Write a protein that binds this ligand. Structure first.
Ligand SMILES: CCCCCCCCCCCCCCCCCC(=O)OC[C@H](COP(=O)([O-])OCC(O)COP(=O)([O-])OC[C@@H](COC(=O)CCCCCCCCCCCCCCCCC)OC(=O)CCCCCCCCCCCCCCCCC)OC(=O)CCCCCCCCCCCCCCCCC
Ligand code: BCL
Ligand code: BCL
Ligand code: BCL
Ligand code: BCL
Ligand SMILES: CC[C@H]1c2cc3[nH]c4c(c3C)C(=O)[C@H](C(=O)OC)c4c3nc(cc4[nH]c(cc(n2)[C@@H]1C)c(C(C)=O)c4C)[C@@H](C)[C@@H]3CCC(=O)OC/C=C(\C)CCC[C@H](C)CCC[C@H](C)CCCC(C)C
Ligand SMILES: CC[C@H]1c2cc3[nH]c4c(c3C)C(=O)[C@H](C(=O)OC)c4c3nc(cc4[nH]c(cc(n2)[C@@H]1C)c(C(C)=O)c4C)[C@@H](C)[C@@H]3CCC(=O)OC/C=C(\C)CCC[C@H](C)CCC[C@H](C)CCCC(C)C
Ligand SMILES: COC1=C(OC)C(=O)C(C/C=C(\C)CC/C=C(\C)CC/C=C(\C)CC/C=C(\C)CC/C=C(\C)CC/C=C(\C)CC/C=C(\C)CC/C=C(\C)CC/C=C(\C)CCC=C(C)C)=C(C)C1=O
Ligand SMILES: COC(C)(C)C/C=C/C(C)=C/C=C/C(C)=C/C=C/C(C)=C\C=C\C=C(C)\C=C\C=C(/C)CC/C=C(\C)CCC=C(C)C
Ligand SMILES: [Fe+3]
Lengths: 240, 281, 302
């Protein structure tokens, strides 16, 4: 009867939908490959989808996926076993080399632009009308690492203009230079800013940006990656 | 077995127990000590459910159903045939669910990301123990727990429900249904939003978060934002389940009459209790 | 204790943002409203501006006639006495026209004619508003996703009080306008059809409903777990994958050995949710018209 007809129709439909949905999520990272970088044997039952091209605004060009997947960067790791499936120990400073939790992706070395073609992010001292409207103002507060020592002090807040959101804390270290810390990675307390991930002696190790008024997608990734990996790697200092 | 960008992440460490022992993969699957535990508690259980099937003399899935000890056994153990297997399988299930959670924590530690996922999972695991552990123990009888069966467990829902009249009247159950509905509203929207910006009309430029915040203001006057909608999503969700675990911990323990009757408190208020007319009076 | 990004630690504010212009008629937009420090703790603080326009008003107005229409009736019930009105708010109800009247628009007010009136208003209020959501996305050059998925919501709404009542031959089959009034209709509808738990579409409907909560919980928590790398900035991760998109995929890769992309997941999202009212709309359209008892049906299968 109709009911029984409709119910089966639906299962066929749902199948096509799970097919479509799966092949759509294969536009990146695929085709799988061995630990050595060569294409793996079995690629699963799903076939890469036909490629699609995005038209990045502001004349930034285009993007086609799926497309040639490259890491466009060196990886300081070495196998730890003869068989597949084991960890790949770092061959240097995981933090410096940027591997594991300290990993970063080689993204465009330009900044994100708002719907107007302007740098989506700016240091607040260059943003008009922008001011800390609520909460404690970190500017001026000193910054502490996970070893209870002071790394430097906040000198300004880098904000997102279109979404009016704090994103980074430009910190001034002992030698006069600055570093950006992810807003999502620090505890702004009453009389300081606490950084749990890294430990004093590592704040200098954080990557630095070229221009002092804009961060690029790439530099954001190295700054963010570097601090996150400080969660695992820095530990041999994070007493507290 | 690896995605183009995966190797740099497969570094040593992150484990909570055993150290380098189980710190390794198996295809895309990460293992870890807790990856073993879940296998253990899952193979054990499935077996118990298989055995429990022969004792019921049925292999059919739309029929098999491991029932809990009868109300007479109270909160004591029961014969493997009279709720015993059930009681044990519940332990395996709980243990499989917990081990899984902690496994995520380790997958988290390795990737250097927050613990929001394993945390939000714990709310489900919570609702589960609310049905098979807290409500029953407070009511002193493993019999108030639900059965393990495709439809047979649906009956349990229906019976337990009509035991208090239209269960629609449970105040919390009323709040939980709202968050569940809202959550679907919010998920449906967020997806249509992001997608309609990354996939604009043919040949046009990919919009930006800006066009998104714009679109909503035009439509509803406000726009929570890209970080907010993801905050709203996690919240609407865990709430819907919190209130669901709540409307059931109070039912049969502190309130055991018809739920439609609980609204008398309202209607029977001094100021209007006797005020003639209306629907009540 | 480490910041979990649920509430901002510091709010920031700049000039009120009027939003992208594109081909929108700024003439019809409004003015920016107040900022909200309370709201700004979770998301955006800027209230307004909102685009009114024609279509919007038709809805915004039509939507009050429907609201007020039922409101009048409620007082007629509480005997214009506030104490009562307030006391029995959940119990009042503007029932639909009795079966006798059928699908005719001849039933008197106190006999189901007022219901017709109100509904009409609602039918306008929703549809006009639907065209609004499609329009406002066009003016910005965006896709019609929001408009399309909203259709799926409309689907179930159309079946519950229009499509089905019409197919049944009576405006009576509809849903009453009342808090408890409609809760009953719901429980009632089920008992009369052999217990909906036997409706295969209903059980499917639930699957997605729960699925929507499962998915949004995972998605939200994931995007929060990797916001320390700029996760929320989804659209950009889509044009230029970053560690956020990667660690995000790998987590689910190593957990359930299967994963998504920063764009893909949203396709899972919009679809997961949309199927709730699409399958629901079906399970209900068939109940009472082709199937009478879902228990009896779960037996012979037609
Ligand atoms: C009976 C029920 C009737 C009740 C009515 C309620 C209908 C509710 C509809 C909800 C639609 C939500 C769709 C989400 C979506 O993608 O929307 C955007 C999508 C594109 O929007 P856009 O702004 O125009 O384009 C922006 C970009 O250019 C392009 O952007 P894009 O790439 O994001 O969009 C491309 C999109 C294009 O979207 C579509 O083509 C939508 C398809 C609509 C399906 C409607 C479902 C009907 C339910 C049938 C179940 C049977 C039960 C009875 O592609 C898909 O999503 C593909 C869907 C995959 C379908 C798989 C089908 C498998 C069939 C079996 C095959 C054999 C099996 C082998 C094993 O919208 C549509 O195409 C409109 C669909 C509306 C049709 C309504 C039907 C009229 C009545
Ligand atoms: C799907 C099957 C049934 C059904 C079954 C149920 C069940 C079961 C329940 C509800 C409940 C609700 N239903 Mg219903 N409901 C149906 C169809 C509808 C239709 C329609 C146009 O077809 C509408 C408008 C509603 C609307 C509503 C809400 C009033 C209420 C849920 C809150 C919520 O989060 O909503 C999602 C929507 C939003 C978040 C946006 C709009 C919300 C508006 C602004 C506020 C309503 C406030 C309420 C009247 C406040 C009381 C406050 C007093 C101080 C106590 N239902 C169909 C016919 N509905 C719940 C309830 O609490 O009922 C008493 C509940 O348990
Ligand atoms: C006729 C029956 C009554 C009724 C009786 C009940 C009863 C009785 C109960 C509910 C409950 C609920 N009801 Mg009701 N309900 C009615 C009508 C309605 C209507 C409606 C529109 O009419 C609605 C929207 C609802 C909605 C709801 C939900 C709010 C809530 C269930 C969700 C939940 O708790 O999830 C919580 C989620 C979980 C428990 C899942 C946990 C998952 C675990 C951790 C993992 C499992 C993993 C699995 C084994 C792994 C598989 C792996 C393989 C590899 C695949 N009810 C009618 C009136 N309702 C329930 C509730 O509140 O429960 C707490 C409940 O007990
Ligand atoms: C919440 C209140 C009630 C309840 C009320 C209902 C109601 C009412 C309905 C269901 C329905 C379902 N319930 Mg239930 N259900 C409860 C508790 C559970 C528990 C548990 C461990 O406590 C589990 C595993 C399930 C599982 C299920 C699914 C089999 C089915 C829903 C599909 C879905 O989308 O789910 C959400 C999950 C996902 C989208 C994730 C994917 C998970 C898959 C689907 C799991 C399949 C499990 C398989 C059938 C069991 C395998 C066990 C083996 C030992 C491994 N329920 C509680 C006790 N459930 C629906 C149905 O159609 O049932 C026949 C339905 O209408
Ligand atoms: C005793 C009663 C029966 C029962 C009878 C029914 C009936 C009858 C129906 C459902 C339906 C549903 N039931 Mg049930 N259901 C039961 C038990 C359960 C249990 C359980 C654990 O026991 C669960 C999880 C569910 C779950 C569900 C959902 C999957 C589904 C509704 C989806 C939805 O979002 O609708 C809500 C969404 C809408 C109605 C969308 C339309 C909204 C419109 C477009 C908006 C109008 C807005 C207005 C103009 C604006 C107001 C806003 C202002 C700001 C105020 N039921 C029991 C067994 N259930 C519905 C369905 O579709 O089933 C197949 C349905 O009709
Ligand atoms: C709490 C908020 C919401 C939520 C969140 C949530 N669920 C989650 C997560 C999160 C954040 C995960 O990270 C985790 C995941 O990995 O998802 C892909 C998961 C998950 N949510 C799941 C299910 C699920 N979630 C549900 C709901 C929800 N999940 C809520 C809506 C439901 C409902 C309502 O029906 C279900 C079925 C799992 C698929 C998955 C976790 C998988 C897991 O723990 O796997 C290892 C487990 C086993 C090997 C279990 C076997 C155990 C026993 C040996 C046998 C079976 C016993 C059981 C009692 C039988 C029940 C039979 C039924 C017929 C009654
Ligand atoms: C999978 C389908 C899910 C879904 C999706 C969904 N809903 C949607 C959309 C989508 C994709 C929209 O685009 C649309 C929207 O605009 O969202 C913001 C909408 C929408 N979903 C809504 C409701 C809704 N959705 C529901 C459900 C669902 N929606 C599903 C879970 C439910 C339930 C669970 O019952 C409800 C009630 C509407 C809020 C909204 C469409 C708005 C509309 O139709 O408006 C007509 C206008 C009126 C009725 C105006 C009057 C309103 C009040 C009666 C009076 C008070 C308001 C007045 C403004 C006060 C003034 C006070 C003065 C002091 C200033
Ligand atoms: C930041 O963006 C995002 C991503 O990435 C960029 C993502 O990927 C995801 C999540 C990914 C998706 C693809 C969403 C898909 C939709 C769903 C509704 C998923 C839930 C449904 C399922 C059916 C999943 C099935 C679940 C499992 C766990 C299958 C695993 C199979 C087994 C047999 C279990 C393995 C068993 C054990 C015991 C482990 C130990 C193993 C040994 C071998 C030992 C989200 C939310 C996201 O937001
Ligand atoms: C304080 O007092 C004032 C005056 C301010 C007023 C207060 C207002 C109040 C107290 C309002 C209370 C209303 C409530 C609580 C309403 C609740 C409605 C609910 C819960 C559900 C609604 C279900 C309705 C759905 C199923 C309706 C669908 C309707 C349609 C699909 C359209 C129907 C179409 C019809 C009859 C045909 C009309 C003709 C044409 C052109 C086709
Ligand atoms: Fe998202």
């Amino acid at each position: 009867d109709l009911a029984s007809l409709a119910i089966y129709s639906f299962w066929i439909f749902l199948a096509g939908l799970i097919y479509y949905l799966q092949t759509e999520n294969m536009r990146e990272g695929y085709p799988l490959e061995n630990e050595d970088g060569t294409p793996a044997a079995n690629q699963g039952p799903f076939p890469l989808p036909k490629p699609k091209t995005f038209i990045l605004p502001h004349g930034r060009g285009t993007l086609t996926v799926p497309g040639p997947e490259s890491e466009d960067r060196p990886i300081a790791l070495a196998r730890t076993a003869v068989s597949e499936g084991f960890p790949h120990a770092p061959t240097g400073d995981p933090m410096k080399d940027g591997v594991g939790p300290a990993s970063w992706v080689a993204r465009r070395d330009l900044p994100e632009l708002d719907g107007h073609g302007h740098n989506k992010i700016k240091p607040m001292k260059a943003a008009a009308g922008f001011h800390v409207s609520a909460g404690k103002n970190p500017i001026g507060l000193p910054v502490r690492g996970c070893d209870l020592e002071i790394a430097g002090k906040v000198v300004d807040i880098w904000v997102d203009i279109p979404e009016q959101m704090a994103r980074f804390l430009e910190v001034e270290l002992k030698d006069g230079s600055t570093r950006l810390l992810p807003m999502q990675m620090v505890k702004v307390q009453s009389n300081r800013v606490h950084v749990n991930a890294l430990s004093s002696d590592l704040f200098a190790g954080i990557p630095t940006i070229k221009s002092p008024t804009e961060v690029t997608l790439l530099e954001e990734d190295k700054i963010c990656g570097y601090v996150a990996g400080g969660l695992m790697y820095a530990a041999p200092k994070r007493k507290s | 077995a690896l995605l183009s960008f995966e190797r740099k992440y497969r570094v040593p460490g992150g484990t909570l127990v055993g150290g380098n022992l189980f710190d390794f993969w198996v295809g895309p699957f990460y293992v870890g000590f807790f990856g073993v535990a879940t296998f253990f508690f899952a193979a054990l259980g499935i077996i118990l459910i298989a055995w429990s099937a022969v004792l019921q003399g049925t292999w059919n899935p739309q029929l098999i159903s491991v029932y809990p000890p009868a109300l007479e056994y109270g909160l004591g153990g029961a014969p493997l045939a009279k709720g015993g297997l059930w009681q044990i399988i519940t332990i395996c299930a709980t243990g499989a669910f917990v081990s899984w959670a902690l496994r995520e924590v380790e997958i988290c530690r390795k990737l250097g990301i927050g613990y929001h996922i394993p945390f939000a999972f714990a709310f489900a695991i919570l609702a589960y123990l609310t049905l098979v552990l807290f409500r029953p123990v407070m009511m002193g009888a493993w019999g108030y727990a639900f059965p393990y069966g495709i439809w047979t467990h649906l009956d349990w829902v229906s019976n337990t429900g009509y035991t208090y009249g239209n269960f629609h009247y449970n105040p919390a159950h009323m709040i939980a249904i709202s968050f569940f509905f809202t959550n679907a509203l919010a998920l449906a929207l967020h997806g249509a939003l992001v997608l309609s910006a990354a996939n604009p009309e043919k040949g046009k430029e990919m919009r930006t978060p800006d066009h998104e915040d714009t679109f909503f203001r035009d439509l509803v006057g406000y726009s929570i934002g890209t970080l907010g909608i993801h905050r709203l999503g996690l919240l609407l969700s865990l709430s819907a389940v919190f209130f669901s675990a709540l409307c059931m911990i109070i039912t049969g323990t502190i309130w055991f009459d018809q739920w439609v009757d609980w609204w008398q408190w309202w209607v029977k208020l001094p100021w209007w209790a006797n005020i003639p007319g209306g629907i009540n009076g | 204790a480490e910041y979990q990004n649920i509430f901002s630690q510091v709010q920031v504010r700049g000039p009120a943002d009027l939003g992208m212009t594109e081909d929108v008629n700024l003439a019809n937009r409004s003015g920016v409203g107040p900022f909200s420090t309370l709201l700004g703790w979770f998301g955006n603080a800027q209230l307004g501006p909102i685009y009114l326009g024609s279509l919007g008003v038709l809805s915004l107005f039509s939507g009050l006639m429907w609201f007020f229409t039922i409101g009048i009736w409620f007082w007629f019930q509480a005997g214009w006495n506030p104490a009562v009105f307030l006391r029995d708010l959940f119990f009042f109800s503007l029932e639909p026209p009795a079966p006798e009247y059928g699908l005719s628009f001849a039933a008197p007010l106190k006999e189901g004619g007022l219901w017709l009136i109100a509904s009409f208003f609602m039918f306008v209020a929703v549809w006009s508003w639907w065209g609004r959501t499609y329009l406002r996305a066009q003016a910005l050059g965006m896709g019609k996703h929001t408009a399309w998925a909203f259709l799926s919501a409309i689907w179930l709404w159309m079946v519950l009080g229009f499509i089905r009542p019409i197919l049944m031959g009576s405006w009576s089959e509809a849903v009453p306008y009342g808090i408890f009034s409609h809760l009953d209709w719901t429980n009632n509808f089920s008992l009369v059809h052999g217990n909906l738990f036997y409706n295969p579409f209903h059980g499917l409907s639930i699957a997605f409903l729960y699925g929507s909560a499962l998915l949004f919980a995972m998605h939200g928590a994931t995007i929060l777990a990797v916001s320390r790398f700029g996760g929320e900035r989804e659209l950009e991760q889509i044009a230029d994958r970053g560690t956020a998109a990667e660690r995000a995929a790998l987590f689910w890769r190593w957990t359930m050995g299967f994963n998504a992309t920063m764009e893909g997941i949203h396709r899972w999202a919009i679809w997961m949710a949309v199927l709730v009212t699409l399958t629901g709309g079906i399970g209900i359209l068939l109940s009472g018209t082709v199937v009478d008892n879902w228990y009896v049906w779960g037996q012979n299968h037609g």
